Every structure is written in C-alpha cells, then in structure tokens.
C-alpha cells in the first residue's frame, strides 16, 4: 500500500 | 509507493 | 515510504 | 500539509 | 509546502 | 515550514 | 500579518 | 510586511 | 516590523 | 501619527 | 510626520 | 515630532 | 501659537 | 510667530 | 516668542 502522508511544510 | 506531500 | 514535506 | 503562517512583520 | 505570510 | 514575516 | 503602527513624529 | 506610519 | 515615525 | 503642535512664539 | 506650528 | 515654534 | 504682545512704549 | 506689537 | 515694543 502507498506511505502515509508526509510533514508539514 | 511514497505517500501524499505533507 | 512517508511522502515529502508540505 | 502547508506550515502555519509566518510572523508579524 | 512553506505556509502563507505573517 | 512557517512562512515568511509579514 | 501586518506589523504594528509606528511612532508619533 | 512593515506597518503603517504613526 | 513597526511602521515609520509620523 | 502626527506629532503635537510647537511651543509658543 | 512633524506637528503643526505653535 | 512637536512641530515648529509660532 | 504666536506669544504675546511686546511691552508698551 | 512672533506675537503683536505692544 | 513676545512681540516688539510700542
């Protein structure tokens, strides 16, 4: 399954 | 495959 | 693997 | 997701 | 992304 | 991250 | 947001 | 950005 | 920043 | 703002 | 700015 | 600033 | 202002 | 201003 | 300042 989301900017 | 952007 | 930054 | 808003000017 | 301006 | 001064 | 008012002249 | 005049 | 002097 | 009016000719 | 005149 | 003399 | 009025004659 | 003869 | 003699 895809990653989860990334940090915030 | 990667995640989302943040 | 975790996205990339926002 | 974006980051917060910067500081006052 | 960066976050909007102060 | 934050975004510039205002 | 915008900085604060300046000084009285 | 900069505020206004006193 | 504070503005200008008036 | 404006500064307060001058002294007294 | 300056003040007015005395 | 206090404005000028009368 | 304008001062005063000067002294007498 | 100066102010008025006397 | 006061204004000149009579």
Do not use: K
């Not at chain 1, 399954?1 to 900017?9: A, K, M, Q, S, T």
């Not at chain 2, 495959?1 to 943040?6: A, E, I, K």
């Amino acid at each position: 399954p895809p990653g989860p989301p990334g940090p915030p900017g | 495959p990667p995640g989302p952007p943040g």
